[PDB]
Design a protein around this ligand. Structure first.
Ligand SMILES: *[C@@H]1O[C@H](CO)[C@@H](O[C@@H]2O[C@H](CO)[C@@H](O)[C@H](O)[C@H]2NC(C)=O)[C@H](O)[C@H]1NC(C)=O
Ligand SMILES: *[C@@H]1O[C@H](CO)[C@@H](O[C@@H]2O[C@H](CO)[C@@H](O)[C@H](O)[C@H]2NC(C)=O)[C@H](O)[C@H]1NC(C)=O
Ligand SMILES: *[C@@H]1O[C@H](CO)[C@@H](O[C@@H]2O[C@H](CO)[C@@H](O)[C@H](O)[C@H]2NC(C)=O)[C@H](O)[C@H]1NC(C)=O
Ligand SMILES: *[C@@H]1O[C@H](CO)[C@@H](O[C@@H]2O[C@H](CO)[C@@H](O)[C@H](O)[C@H]2NC(C)=O)[C@H](O)[C@H]1NC(C)=O
Ligand SMILES: *[C@@H]1O[C@H](CO)[C@@H](O[C@@H]2O[C@H](CO)[C@@H](O)[C@H](O)[C@H]2NC(C)=O)[C@H](O)[C@H]1NC(C)=O
Ligand SMILES: *[C@@H]1O[C@H](CO)[C@@H](O[C@@H]2O[C@H](CO)[C@@H](O)[C@H](O)[C@H]2NC(C)=O)[C@H](O)[C@H]1NC(C)=O
Ligand SMILES: CCCCC/C=C\C/C=C/CCCCCCCC(=O)O
Ligand SMILES: *[C@@H]1O[C@H](CO)[C@@H](O)[C@H](O)[C@H]1NC(C)=O
Ligand SMILES: *[C@@H]1O[C@H](CO)[C@@H](O)[C@H](O)[C@H]1NC(C)=O
Ligand SMILES: *[C@@H]1O[C@H](CO)[C@@H](O)[C@H](O)[C@H]1NC(C)=O
Ligand SMILES: *[C@@H]1O[C@H](CO)[C@@H](O)[C@H](O)[C@H]1NC(C)=O
Ligand SMILES: *[C@@H]1O[C@H](CO)[C@@H](O)[C@H](O)[C@H]1NC(C)=O
Ligand SMILES: *[C@@H]1O[C@H](CO)[C@@H](O)[C@H](O)[C@H]1NC(C)=O
Ligand SMILES: *[C@@H]1O[C@H](CO)[C@@H](O)[C@H](O)[C@H]1NC(C)=O
Ligand SMILES: *[C@@H]1O[C@H](CO)[C@@H](O)[C@H](O)[C@H]1NC(C)=O
Ligand SMILES: *[C@@H]1O[C@H](CO)[C@@H](O)[C@H](O)[C@H]1NC(C)=O
Ligand SMILES: *[C@@H]1O[C@H](CO)[C@@H](O)[C@H](O)[C@H]1NC(C)=O
Ligand SMILES: *[C@@H]1O[C@H](CO)[C@@H](O)[C@H](O)[C@H]1NC(C)=O
Lengths: 418, 442, 196, 49
């Protein structure tokens, strides 16, 4: 609660945002959830379907009234941010599997599906949606129209499709593409029956693959677009990318495939406005340094503020007041400028020092370098002392400092054996 | 180096008959750029949630701000100790009657807006700073977004550079005072009051301080003044030719710029997080996971700052050692005259001149160098009437027919007399004594 | 203050180090006992390895700062030893090494974590303006002081020691002859007394 | 000894540095090959970072 006399470097100057701006592509189509979630026939897992979803609004609120998913899982992104986001491309991988195999539709999993019919990348961004279809994909006498691959020479690559039906040689002998011992057909099917156990019931699985915040988006959330305000610190949301900053005009000629620009530090420099195909630069609002010049709090509660890199000859200052003057260190507010020089007390910088004079106030002045005098030099005149003084001066030097010892165990793991 | 041999013998000495006044340039760093880092802007730029996570690290931060503040203060103390060693501001007289010595290329010229000398101007024109000004308004980096200037990118990440307390003008004024004191009062202004003395006579003292009788200077005063003026002209031609002469100072500027630029580049690192961009995490992940990734980024960026500060503390120790050396030279070369060999240039030190430079000081060391030596046969003593005569200050030499005694650093033969030598003991003990005669003045 | 700061810095570092124990370093809690009392080992161990890393970094920072300060203290101590040797044990001709003025002698005094030197120096106090000359012509010979300068009070020329006015009559035992008066610039006419 | 210590200090630092390779730093194992040979990339990468 007490601050000693001096100048302190405090937090930089900070502009707060005034309003939020939400911008998205001017698309009003709704995403074809009915054609994906409500389909007459799903593909087999060995020959899974891949539908491209583009140019639409993804609300997913419609699904609540009819669909009830057994599993929902987003890798990459959080399930609650999906409304505040848009995607570069979307693919919907649609197929039917056995219930106990739902766990296999995940990165890092193995099994007859993870290895033979549907493998995911270990760098997967998107969502795995599954629900039971025991009352649709199964009949009496069982449904044998859903096929999976049981034998393969090797595991699949991610998103690899292998529709082939050649005979699998389990044994050492070629089989010349006939069925026989050690020569099995690779394709097998499920017998889904309405009376079958849960893990043997059919499940409908949709995998949504989407790359976020890196390219032009066409599939966007239900978020309202807003009008655009330039040259103000705002909280912006461009195609799901959020942040705070000032939006200005730019001369950056983006290519048709480029949506965002970045600096070496990877922060966003500019965006292409999804509504009007123009490029906007993003400049963070907060800038510059603020220094606080104060006598000790046992003397006065008056302070002066030096605003570095502002000019004062709508200022970016906390408060103008009076007594505002420009120095080469910045704009100093609260200190009275006095023409008289003195020895430096509280240094400001660039030749400027401050002090608290007497009624009382903070003053700022150009520091003196010592008294100015001249020597009476001539080619035939010498100055010689007639008297002398013995002086004693005190020079103080450190020699040693406190010897320390640290027990790493007591500091880090105080009284804990584990 | 070149291989050579010295013609050593037990009765041969080489003594200079002529000399040269040489001027050498010694360049020392004194200060380095004062920096200040806002941990919040660098680590958590414009993110309230990250700042809120960051607040439990308030101590790691305040210890980094303390270390950088300590450095900035020590940079100003270093400058004060190097340049502010004279309590008063001396000024040169209007009449430059310095015995033929031309100082117009090192004294300030009043016609420019900053009272710096020509050589100082050359020094400022060889080393190029990075900031080129301590004001950079928000509009000046708001409209240069087309341009990838480095300073703006620094300042947006919480990295700032503080101005020095002593401006180039104030340092130049201090060096002007130092020149006027040394020239018009010799070393007397350092110890106490500035005691006026003609320049040539102080040079007579400086010659006495190196074992050369003052009559040599007066007899050769015109030669000495011409050699000094030519040496100064050569210093001017050298500084005007190349730029790398001051590389030692440019490296300091470059190192500080490099550190800040490096620090900015570290912001692109993930440190194990899914993304280096705080906004991409926040815009894609809900707080419970954004917080796990963000704590990781905070840790990595804090380590980067810790590394920067440690490197700055080590460099500051380096600069302080250089500044202390510079202050020692200022005191023992500019304010006095040094008997310490090669401390203030090669040769027998006569005098030195300070010049300011960006983040440093340049000393012009004026030294006496023997130029033309000769081979004389010598002897440690001469027997006369059985007595052994020794030089009090000098050596015995012979040109082959006559023995003379002469000052050590400049051939000035004198007749052997009772007022130049002293007697102790006798000739039968000392090895290498020769026979001669000693003249006894009437 | 120069010595007090050393004490303060070391105290501050230790106090700062203690305060760092309150940091989470990304863990759910800075308190080891609250983790152990709430979480089973497989997760307490994940959080605890994190605290160990953070606190080890804090110690690493402290030690680095202490090494740098120790280098600072060593440089100061080496300077102090140099002064002890060249000022207390001897007499220094090095300007402003042992105080302002012409150094005479120094006295050590001990202090907490340091040394205080009392430097006794000679400082000229009252100066005078004399007209001078580098040499005097007598019989055509140029006479120079061996150690001192020529001064005149306006009517008579005297020679005196450099740092204290002590005028002496110009004699053959105070000056020396080399060459002649027609080369040296600023030579004046006078007489040189020859003792009997 | 004043010179031998310099040699020893540099040797000690390098030997110490090598010994630090045995530390887990919170990972399941200090050996990169044991992680890679036991864990698939998404988790080997978490331990390896
Ligand atoms: C992709 O195709 C190649 C070529 O058909 C497969 O590699 C072959 O695998 C068989 C397995 O018995 C080997 O006998 C061949 O010699 C391989 N040929 C080559 C060129 O590698 C590969 O396994 C296939 N990949 C997948 C995932 O099925
Ligand atoms: C040299 O200075 C000292 C003091 O700096 C003079 O001593 C003083 O003389 C006055 C007058 O006689 C006395 O009243 C003071 O008490 C003396 N002070 C001390 C400390 O003794 C001394 O006389 C001066 N000498 C000359 C030749 O001027
Ligand atoms: C000592 O050396 C200097 C030069 O190093 C000599 O001065 C030169 O003398 C020649 C011949 O008279 C002139 O042509 C040059 O112009 C002189 N140079 C300068 C800078 O004045 C000087 O004569 C030498 N003295 C002795 C005794 O040898
Ligand atoms: C000192 O040397 C300079 C050259 O180095 C002489 O010439 C002067 O140079 C300055 C700056 O280059 C000019 O402003 C002056 O006008 C020059 N003077 C003349 C007469 O041309 C300078 O004259 C020398 N000083 C003396 C006293 O001779
Ligand atoms: C220097 O002079 C002395 C004295 O004249 C020489 O000493 C004489 O040496 C000769 C031969 O060695 C003796 O016969 C004399 O008796 C010596 N006289 C005395 C007084 O001692 C000495 O030899 C001379 N040395 C040289 C190198 O010339
Ligand atoms: C110092 O004394 C000498 C010798 O008396 C002076 O030299 C004389 O100067 C006059 C006029 O310049 C000549 O007419 C004489 O012939 C000179 N005599 C000799 C022996 O050279 C010299 O001028 C005097 N200088 C001063 C400043 O008084
Ligand atoms: C038909 C194309 C859909 C494309 C959408 C792409 C990305 C965005 C994903 C949105 C959510 C998918 C449906 C799950 C909704 C949650 C249902 C629930 O938990 O109750
Ligand atoms: C899915 O089907 C059910 C019943 O057929 C229907 O009520 C629901 O609206 C459908 N979903 C969509 C998105 O049309
Ligand atoms: C609507 O979309 C079109 C693109 O077809 C665009 O030109 C227009 O600007 C959008 N609306 C607004 C308000 O920007
Ligand atoms: C502050 O000022 C008060 C006088 O009101 C004084 O008693 C106190 O000791 C001072 N403290 C400091 C730290 O300056
Ligand atoms: C901005 O400040 C500089 C000094 O730093 C001053 O010279 C300039 O005139 C100022 N700008 C204006 C518009 O006055
Ligand atoms: C300072 O001096 C300037 C001109 O030299 C003058 O205009 C100004 O009013 C003076 N201010 C004060 C407070 O004396
Ligand atoms: C001195 O003598 C040696 C050998 O006798 C010779 O090499 C050297 O050059 C001589 N010195 C000079 C200045 O000639
Ligand atoms: C030595 O010097 C004297 C004095 O001038 C001279 O007379 C003599 O001839 C010189 N001898 C030689 C060999 O140079
Ligand atoms: C000097 O050296 C020479 C040759 O080595 C020798 O003949 C002579 O006697 C020596 N003189 C002395 C005094 O050592
Ligand atoms: C010496 O003379 C100058 C000018 O002639 C004068 O200013 C100075 O005060 C004089 N010295 C003394 C000690 O009076
Ligand atoms: C100079 O000193 C002498 C010696 O005491 C004296 O006789 C003479 O009058 C003095 N002259 C002046 C002007 O002081
Ligand atoms: C000394 O300076 C004065 C005035 O500048 C001049 O008249 C006088 O001749 C000069 N004397 C010498 C020896 O330089």
């Amino acid at each position: 609660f007490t601050v000693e006399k001096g100048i302190y470097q405090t937090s930089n100057f900070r502009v707060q945002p005034t309003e939020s701006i939400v911008r998205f592509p001017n698309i009003t189509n709704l995403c074809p959830f009915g054609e994906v979630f409500n389909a007459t026939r799903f593909a087999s897992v060995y020959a899974w379907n891949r539908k491209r979803i583009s140019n639409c609004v993804a609300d997913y609120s419609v699904l609540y009234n009819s669909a009830s998913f057994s599993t929902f899982k987003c890798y990459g992104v959080s399930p609650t941010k999906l409304n505040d986001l848009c995607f570069t491309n979307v693919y919907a991988d649609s197929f039917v599997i056995r219930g106990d195999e739902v766990r296999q539709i995940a990165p890092g999993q193995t099994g007859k599906i993870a290895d033979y019919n549907y493998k995911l990348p270990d760098d997967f961004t998107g969502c795995v949606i599954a629900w039971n279809s025991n009352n649709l994909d199964s009949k009496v006498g069982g449904n044998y129209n859903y096929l999976y691959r049981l034998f393969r020479k090797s595991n699949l690559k991610p998103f690899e499709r292998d529709i082939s039906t050649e005979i699998y040689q389990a044994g050492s002998t070629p089989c010349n593409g006939v069925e026989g011992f050690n020569c099995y057909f690779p394709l097998q099917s499920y017998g889904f029956q309405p009376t079958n156990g849960v893990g043997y019931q059919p499940y409908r699985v949709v995998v949504l693959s989407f790359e976020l915040l890196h390219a032009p988006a066409t599939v966007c959330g239900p978020k309202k677009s807003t009008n655009l305000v330039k040259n103000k610190c705002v909280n912006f949301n461009f195609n799901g990318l959020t942040g705070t900053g000032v939006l200005t005009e730019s001369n950056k000629k983006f290519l048709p495939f480029q949506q965002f620009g970045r600096d070496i530090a990877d922060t966003t420099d500019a965006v292409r406005d999804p509504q009007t195909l123009e490029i906007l630069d993003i400049t963070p609002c907060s800038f510059g340094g603020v220094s606080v010049i104060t006598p000790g709090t046992n003397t006065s509660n008056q302070v002066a503020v030096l605003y570095q890199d502002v000019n004062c000859t709508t200022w970016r200052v906390y408060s103008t007041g009076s007594n505002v003057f420009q120095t080469r260190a910045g704009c100093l507010i609260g200190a009275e400028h006095v023409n008289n020089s003195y020895e430096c007390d509280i240094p400001i910088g660039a030749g400027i020092c401050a002090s608290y004079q007497t009624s009382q106030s903070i003053i700022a002045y150009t520091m003196s370098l010592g008294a100015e005098n001249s020597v009476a030099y001539s080619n035939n005149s010498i100055a010689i002392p007639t008297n002398f003084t013995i002086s004693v001066t005190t020079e103080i030097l450190p020699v040693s400092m406190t010897k320390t010892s640290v027990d790493c165990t007591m500091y880090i793991c105080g009284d804990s054996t584990e | 180096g070149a291989e050579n041999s010295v013609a050593y013998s037990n009765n041969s000495i080489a003594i200079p008959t002529n000399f040269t006044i040489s001027v050498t340039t010694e360049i020392l760093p004194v200060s380095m750029t004062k920096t200040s880092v806002d941990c919040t802007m660098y680590i958590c730029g414009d993110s309230t949630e990250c700042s809120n996570l960051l607040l439990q690290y308030g101590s790691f931060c305040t210890q980094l701000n303390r270390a950088l503040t300590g450095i900035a203060v020590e940079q100003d103390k270093n400058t004060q100790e190097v340049f502010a060693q004279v309590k008063q501001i001396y000024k040169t007289p209007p009449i430059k009657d310095f015995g033929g010595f031309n100082f117009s290329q090192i004294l300030p010229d009043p016609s420019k807006p900053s009272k710096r000398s020509f050589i100082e101007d050359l020094l400022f024109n060889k080393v190029t700073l990075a900031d080129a000004g301590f004001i950079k308004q928000y509009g000046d980096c708001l409209g240069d977004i087309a341009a990838r200037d480095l300073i703006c990118a620094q300042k947006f990440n919480g990295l700032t550079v503080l101005p020095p307390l002593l401006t180039d003008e104030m340092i130049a004024q201090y060096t002007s005072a130092l020149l006027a004191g040394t020239i018009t009062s010799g070393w007397t202004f350092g110890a106490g009051a500035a005691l006026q003395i003609p320049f040539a006579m102080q040079m007579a003292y400086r010659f006495n301080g190196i074992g050369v009788t003052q009559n040599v200077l007066y007899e050769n005063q015109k030669l000495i003044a011409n050699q000094f003026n030519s040496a100064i002209g050569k210093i001017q031609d050298s500084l005007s030719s190349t730029a790398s002469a001051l590389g030692k100072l440019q490296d300091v500027v470059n190192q500080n710029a490099q550190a800040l630029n490096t620090l900015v580049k570290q912001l692109s690192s993930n440190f194990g997080a899914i993304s280096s961009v705080l906004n991409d995490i926040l815009s894609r992940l809900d707080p419970p996971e954004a917080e796990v990734q963000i704590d990781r980024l905070i840790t990595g960026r804090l380590q980067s700052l810790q590394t920067y500060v440690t490197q700055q503390l080590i460099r500051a120790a380096e600069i302080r050692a250089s500044a202390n050396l510079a202050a020692t030279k200022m005191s023992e070369c500019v304010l006095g005259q040094s008997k310490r060999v090669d401390f203030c240039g090669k040769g027998y030190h006569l005098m030195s001149f300070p010049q300011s430079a960006p983040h440093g000081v340049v000393f012009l060391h004026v030294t006496y160098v023997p130029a033309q030596e000769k081979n004389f046969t010598t002897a440690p003593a001469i027997c006369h009437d059985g007595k052994a005569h020794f030089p009090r200050e000098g050596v015995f030499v012979s040109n082959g027919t006559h023995w003379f005694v002469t000052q050590r650093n400049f051939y000035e033969p004198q007749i052997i007399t009772t007022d130049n030598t002293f007697v102790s003991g006798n000739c039968d003990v000392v090895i290498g004594i020769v026979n001669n005669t000693v003249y006894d003045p009437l």
